[PDB]
Design an enzyme around this catalytic site. Structure first.
Site, PDB file in Angstrom:
ATOM      1  N   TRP A   1       3.176   9.271   8.932  1.00 35.17           N
ATOM      2  CA  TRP A   1       4.318   8.643  10.083  1.00 35.17           C
ATOM      3  C   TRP A   1       5.378   8.302   9.222  1.00 35.17           C
ATOM      4  O   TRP A   1       6.555   8.408   9.872  1.00 35.17           O
ATOM      5  CB  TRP A   1       3.536   7.441  10.689  1.00 35.17           C
ATOM      6  CG  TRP A   1       2.879   7.975  11.964  1.00 35.17           C
ATOM      7  CD1 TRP A   1       2.257   9.034  12.529  1.00 35.17           C
ATOM      8  CD2 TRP A   1       2.621   7.070  13.128  1.00 35.17           C
ATOM      9  NE1 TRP A   1       1.677   8.951  13.760  1.00 35.17           N
ATOM     10  CE2 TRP A   1       2.072   7.941  14.225  1.00 35.17           C
ATOM     11  CE3 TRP A   1       2.930   5.512  13.535  1.00 35.17           C
ATOM     12  CZ2 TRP A   1       1.587   7.266  15.368  1.00 35.17           C
ATOM     13  CZ3 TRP A   1       2.537   5.165  14.596  1.00 35.17           C
ATOM     14  CH2 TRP A   1       1.857   5.804  15.680  1.00 35.17           C
ATOM     15  N   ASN A   2       5.248   7.853   8.163  1.00 38.43           N
ATOM     16  CA  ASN A   2       6.511   7.306   7.218  1.00 38.43           C
ATOM     17  C   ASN A   2       7.149   8.546   6.784  1.00 38.43           C
ATOM     18  O   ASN A   2       8.493   8.382   6.980  1.00 38.43           O
ATOM     19  CB  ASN A   2       5.858   6.280   6.018  1.00 38.43           C
ATOM     20  CG  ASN A   2       7.010   5.931   5.169  1.00 38.43           C
ATOM     21  OD1 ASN A   2       8.054   5.192   5.487  1.00 38.43           O
ATOM     22  ND2 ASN A   2       7.215   6.572   3.953  1.00 38.43           N
TER      23      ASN A   2
ATOM     24  N   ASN B   1       7.181  -4.966   5.305  1.00 37.00           N
ATOM     25  CA  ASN B   1       8.062  -6.135   5.899  1.00 37.00           C
ATOM     26  C   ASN B   1       7.361  -7.501   5.314  1.00 37.00           C
ATOM     27  O   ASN B   1       8.284  -8.314   5.027  1.00 37.00           O
ATOM     28  CB  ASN B   1       8.182  -6.163   7.240  1.00 37.00           C
ATOM     29  CG  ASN B   1       9.236  -5.180   7.769  1.00 37.00           C
ATOM     30  OD1 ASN B   1      10.516  -5.172   7.852  1.00 37.00           O
ATOM     31  ND2 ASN B   1       9.028  -3.914   7.953  1.00 37.00           N
TER      32      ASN B   1
ATOM     33  N   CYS C   1       4.498   2.845  11.734  1.00 35.13           N
ATOM     34  CA  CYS C   1       2.588   2.641  12.036  1.00 35.13           C
ATOM     35  C   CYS C   1       2.747   1.339  12.496  1.00 35.13           C
ATOM     36  O   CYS C   1       2.018   0.823  13.603  1.00 35.13           O
ATOM     37  CB  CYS C   1       1.973   2.548  10.484  1.00 35.13           C
ATOM     38  SG  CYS C   1       0.339   2.541  10.919  1.00 35.13           S
ATOM     39  N   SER C   2       3.293   0.283  11.852  1.00 37.25           N
ATOM     40  CA  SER C   2       3.319  -1.160  12.475  1.00 37.25           C
ATOM     41  C   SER C   2       1.852  -1.757  12.290  1.00 37.25           C
ATOM     42  O   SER C   2       1.167  -1.406  11.630  1.00 37.25           O
ATOM     43  CB  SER C   2       4.230  -1.500  13.556  1.00 37.25           C
ATOM     44  OG  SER C   2       4.452  -2.502  13.977  1.00 37.25           O
TER      45      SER C   2
ATOM     46  N   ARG D   1      12.888   8.718  14.811  1.00 40.19           N
ATOM     47  CA  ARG D   1      14.341   8.315  15.161  1.00 40.19           C
ATOM     48  C   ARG D   1      15.107   8.861  16.397  1.00 40.19           C
ATOM     49  O   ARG D   1      15.416   7.953  17.010  1.00 40.19           O
ATOM     50  CB  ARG D   1      15.214   8.960  13.686  1.00 40.19           C
ATOM     51  CG  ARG D   1      16.542   8.151  13.552  1.00 40.19           C
ATOM     52  CD  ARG D   1      16.587   6.796  13.126  1.00 40.19           C
ATOM     53  NE  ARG D   1      18.140   6.624  13.186  1.00 40.19           N
ATOM     54  CZ  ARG D   1      18.930   6.088  14.172  1.00 40.19           C
ATOM     55  NH1 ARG D   1      18.499   6.493  15.485  1.00 40.19           N
ATOM     56  NH2 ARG D   1      20.457   5.849  13.805  1.00 40.19           N
TER      57      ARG D   1
ATOM     58  N   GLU E   1       2.010  -6.019   8.840  1.00 43.44           N
ATOM     59  CA  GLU E   1       3.381  -5.296   8.718  1.00 43.44           C
ATOM     60  C   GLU E   1       4.119  -5.954  10.256  1.00 43.44           C
ATOM     61  O   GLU E   1       3.465  -6.451  10.793  1.00 43.44           O
ATOM     62  CB  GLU E   1       3.261  -3.852   8.987  1.00 43.44           C
ATOM     63  CG  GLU E   1       4.320  -2.824   9.075  1.00 43.44           C
ATOM     64  CD  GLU E   1       5.496  -2.919   8.337  1.00 43.44           C
ATOM     65  OE1 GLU E   1       5.559  -3.837   7.567  1.00 43.44           O
ATOM     66  OE2 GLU E   1       6.159  -1.950   8.321  1.00 43.44           O
ATOM     67  N   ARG E   2       5.403  -5.741  10.039  1.00 47.19           N
ATOM     68  CA  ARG E   2       6.205  -6.211  11.105  1.00 47.19           C
ATOM     69  C   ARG E   2       5.833  -5.367  12.512  1.00 47.19           C
ATOM     70  O   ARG E   2       5.387  -4.236  12.405  1.00 47.19           O
ATOM     71  CB  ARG E   2       7.881  -5.664  10.846  1.00 47.19           C
ATOM     72  CG  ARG E   2       8.648  -5.791  11.901  1.00 47.19           C
ATOM     73  CD  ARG E   2      10.180  -6.186  11.542  1.00 47.19           C
ATOM     74  NE  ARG E   2      11.075  -5.388  11.020  1.00 47.19           N
ATOM     75  CZ  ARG E   2      11.999  -4.746  12.076  1.00 47.19           C
ATOM     76  NH1 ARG E   2      11.883  -5.163  13.090  1.00 47.19           N
ATOM     77  NH2 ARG E   2      12.713  -3.781  11.150  1.00 47.19           N
TER      78      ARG E   2
ATOM     79  N   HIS F   1       2.314  -5.231   3.130  1.00 56.06           N
ATOM     80  CA  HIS F   1       2.927  -4.057   3.712  1.00 56.06           C
ATOM     81  C   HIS F   1       4.547  -4.303   3.383  1.00 56.06           C
ATOM     82  O   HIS F   1       4.756  -5.243   2.596  1.00 56.06           O
ATOM     83  CB  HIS F   1       2.888  -4.311   5.189  1.00 56.06           C
ATOM     84  CG  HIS F   1       1.324  -4.142   5.818  1.00 56.06           C
ATOM     85  ND1 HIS F   1       0.514  -2.917   5.660  1.00 56.06           N
ATOM     86  CD2 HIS F   1       0.476  -5.274   5.904  1.00 56.06           C
ATOM     87  CE1 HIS F   1      -0.750  -3.313   6.167  1.00 56.06           C
ATOM     88  NE2 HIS F   1      -0.572  -4.629   6.096  1.00 56.06           N
TER      89      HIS F   1
ATOM     90  N   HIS G   1       1.049  -1.139   0.009  1.00 53.70           N
ATOM     91  CA  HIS G   1      -0.073  -0.036   0.034  1.00 53.70           C
ATOM     92  C   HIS G   1       0.751   1.428  -0.058  1.00 53.70           C
ATOM     93  O   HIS G   1       2.163   1.363   0.411  1.00 53.70           O
ATOM     94  CB  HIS G   1      -0.824  -0.005   1.188  1.00 53.70           C
ATOM     95  CG  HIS G   1      -0.123   0.091   2.654  1.00 53.70           C
ATOM     96  ND1 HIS G   1       0.295   1.084   3.060  1.00 53.70           N
ATOM     97  CD2 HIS G   1       0.139  -1.051   3.277  1.00 53.70           C
ATOM     98  CE1 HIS G   1       0.875   0.685   4.166  1.00 53.70           C
ATOM     99  NE2 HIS G   1       0.734  -0.467   4.386  1.00 53.70           N
TER     100      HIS G   1
ATOM    101  N   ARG H   1      -5.385  -0.682   5.969  1.00 53.81           N
ATOM    102  CA  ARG H   1      -4.893   0.204   4.790  1.00 53.81           C
ATOM    103  C   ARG H   1      -4.606  -1.054   3.658  1.00 53.81           C
ATOM    104  O   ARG H   1      -4.644  -0.743   2.379  1.00 53.81           O
ATOM    105  CB  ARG H   1      -3.802   0.726   5.236  1.00 53.81           C
ATOM    106  CG  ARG H   1      -2.569  -0.002   5.802  1.00 53.81           C
ATOM    107  CD  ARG H   1      -1.692   0.735   6.647  1.00 53.81           C
ATOM    108  NE  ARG H   1      -0.526   0.170   7.347  1.00 53.81           N
ATOM    109  CZ  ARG H   1      -0.467  -0.309   8.683  1.00 53.81           C
ATOM    110  NH1 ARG H   1      -1.484  -0.400   9.369  1.00 53.81           N
ATOM    111  NH2 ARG H   1       0.728  -0.566   8.823  1.00 53.81           N
TER     112      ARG H   1
END
Lengths: 251, 251
Positions: free
Chosen positions: B16-17, B190, B23-24, B100, B89-90, B188, B11, B62
């Protein structure tokens, strides 16, 4: 005969053809803007009442599927499994598909036409290869992967015929999940919703023709241990809006 | 030799990205850009005349909305959809929702590199004090998984993702590929990377570096053992693909 299970069923908003008194039937027409708004209204109403679905059943007509998707989006329940079957499809109106009232009477006779529209058990003439909407239905690969072969699918249906191909899906696929205690949503059509209600409420061949089935309104069924309706089906939401929806489906 | 074709995609990514937050398992909706990417993917798949038989998604909305928008653009809304936490997703554990800077302060600059870029180092588990713990583990979608709520992961390495995805590939997806069905996987970052690693036999070292643009169909050609014949291929216009690669490169 005590209320044990709750089932929600609804029908999508009707389209342009319906205003022109034409039967869309198995023609895979999309929702119009009014249809999409009705689906969203249902989702918001079901959210206000804190419904939590475990399983959704739809037809293989995209207007029933879009209705379910829009409802699950309004609920934040998009992860809820969806299953689609030709056995929840709108009635197959055969040769009458795409004709208004006037055109039907001219082509087939005024007598035959009353029965075909209003009777329980009179099957319209089968759709033939010459029909402008024949190819669009029978060359669609969704009908190559049904639980019966393409050539075993109906070319026309009475309301009785609809109940007879819907009952096996109710008995084999939906009813077991209701007995497991799952909250089911059925996204259906005018005739498929009417056929299931006839079965669950034991409505007569005579009475079924007259019952009011408004679009974009959640229909609550309270079912006993035998999956028989306890009282009549109930329209959920604001009585003003419901009365409006009832007027729109009046004949 | 090449016998089967499988399509996968990821997607469009969210706000957030752009903030370098993961987001996970937080169930964020597509943004406007994400919804457009899904539609443009569907239009590309239509231009290439793809006919899907089955769609696999995660239980994150999503991935589901991405599939729904693609099926709508294809007129394939009747195609069965199955959703599983095993395509999620992971799970970035305690790191979920941190940028970060915040990660480095809380855990150490060293540990953070490994957790993001390594194949087999598992981040710290998400705890009940985490602001996003309740909205994940109180969600009833995780009460009806193929493992109990308390057995679901609280954090995952990329290796952990492959190991909980493999059982779904082996038991659910692979058999349908062997039946000759054309499958779409709506996944996703991951989960797509994990499945590609497995089917292509990419090393622990090389997997970290492969480019996975969003909103682009990823074609896998598989032999009788469901092993990739050649590398995965990006389908559509090379200009658009190069643009999508730069967006995940530059981020």
């Amino acid at each position: 005969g005590m209320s044990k299970y709750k089932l929600i069923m609804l029908r999508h908003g009707e389209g342009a053809w319906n205003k022109e008194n034409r039967f869309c039937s198995w023609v895979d027409q999309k929702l119009n803007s009014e249809g999409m708004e009705e689906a969203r209204n249902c989702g918001k109403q079901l959210k206000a009442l804190n419904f939590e679905f475990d399983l959704v059943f739809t037809s293989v007509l995209n207007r029933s599927i879009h209705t379910a998707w829009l409802i699950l989006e309004e609920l934040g329940q998009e992860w809820v499994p969806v299953e689609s079957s030709w056995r929840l499809n709108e009635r197959h109106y055969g040769a009458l598909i795409g004709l208004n009232r006037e055109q039907m009477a001219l082509n087939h006779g005024e007598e035959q036409v009353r029965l075909w529209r209003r009777s329980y058990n009179v099957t319209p003439p089968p759709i033939e290869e010459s029909h402008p909407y024949y190819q669009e239905i029978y060359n669609d690969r969704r009908y190559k992967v049904c639980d019966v072969p393409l050539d075993q699918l109906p070319r026309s249906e009475s309301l009785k015929d609809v109940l007879e191909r819907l009952l096996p899906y109710w008995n084999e696929r939906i009813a077991p999940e209701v007995l497991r205690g799952k909250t089911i949503l059925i996204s259906a059509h005018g005739n498929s919703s009417r056929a299931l209600l006839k079965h669950l409420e034991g409505i007569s061949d005579e009475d079924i023709i007259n019952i009011t089935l408004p679009t974009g309104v959640p229909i609550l069924l309270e079912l006993d241990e035998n999956l028989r309706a306890v009282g009549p089906h109930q329209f959920l939401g604001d009585q003003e809006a419901i009365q409006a929806a009832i007027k729109k489906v009046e004949d």
